[PDB]
Amino acid sequence: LIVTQTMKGLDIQKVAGTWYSLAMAASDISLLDAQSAPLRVYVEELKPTPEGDLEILLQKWENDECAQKKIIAEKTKIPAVFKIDALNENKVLVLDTDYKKYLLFCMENSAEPEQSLVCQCLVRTPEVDDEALEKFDKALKALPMHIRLSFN
Template sequence: MALLLLSLWLSLVSAQDLNPRTIVRRNYDIARVSGTWYSISMASDDMKRIEENGDLHVFVQSIESLEDGRLKFNFHFMLHGECVEVAVVCDRTDRNGEYTLAYLGENRLLVSETDYRLFVTFRLQNIRNGTKTQVLALYGRLSELRPSFLHRFEKVCKTYGLGPENIISLSHQDPCYRYRR
């Protein structure tokens, strides 16, 4: 029995390893992104937008691929000390993994990469009053990911000109975590 429990524990631990061969960077099967997600990290070239009280300081609860091709995000955030839930629906474009939405300006949302099973990285490009802002978000199927995922996120951020000083951790910082369904 102890051997069975040990092998089960080892399989769960190894299942959380980052496997570069399973990472998808194009031709996304967006339906496989549907489900429960947790905010792990965010990065931006405008830090005040993703830091506490920033308009993009949100925590993902779930993502749903809708039948018409749109993508629905369920987020929550703190507003005046209360947890507020909001649903955001993004319209699909003609390009695989690319969506648009109207929120504080014009936005393009792109899937950067995913393995569907453990992580997904999104890139948001916002233009508001002529000012461009770039945000990257790392979401995990678990509330915490191993350091290998965080290192990979740093590399992805670097390809978009964002260094470690542009990255914030959101793991274990979700003030509404206890209200998740």
């Protein structure tokens, strides 16, 4: 990705609160094949830390259960780009957000071969509104997504 495709003037403190994963897209089928993929998560909550970092509350499908996992994304030199300092490092890219309604973000795997990428459209409330989905779609044409999910 590029620094221009990311958001500009992002205020991490305004993304706080709960969010709902509405749609999912991925560059490689496998990445979201079954409930399988390690990138097949659902953002439940976003909590920024005073030092500017990003705490993310996810939920996964684990052993017929809905597992809660908490991972922290560290602030990098570039805004809207966060790093999940793990054995396998991941970068959380925030593309666009109005803070109030939607929030589009992606997770990129560097270690992998080409560009393992996965994005999510997050809505504040599960309203019968579809501006978020639209914004999502427009923001994904410029990317090679091979799988596309939309949730009930």
